[PDB]
Design a binder for this molecule. Sequence first.
Ligand SMILES: [Cl-]
Length: 111
Amino acid sequence: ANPEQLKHCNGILKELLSKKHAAYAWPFYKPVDASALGLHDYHDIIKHPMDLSTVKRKMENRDYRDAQEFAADVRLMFSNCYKYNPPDHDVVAMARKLQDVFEFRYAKMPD
Ligand SMILES: [Cl-]
């Protein structure tokens, strides 16, 4: 069932990247460019950066062998946001909204 489940994961990924969610998904599209943002402590705090472009590359390259591996990366991305930013920052609100999209559809995985 890993291939079918991975198609569900790819569908989720496409949805997360889609225009429908862009108002809150956009901070997660590409790796955080810490230097560009003046976040000179980012890589001291976040040991394992993750973003949707990386998830997409990994999916396209058949790196993910199962849905759980995919989910762990998407959740890592959100965790990095929750770790680095104060909980009242807009980006955290954006993360929580995108994570809600993710978790509700991931829960519908065929099995
Ligand atoms: Cl997980």
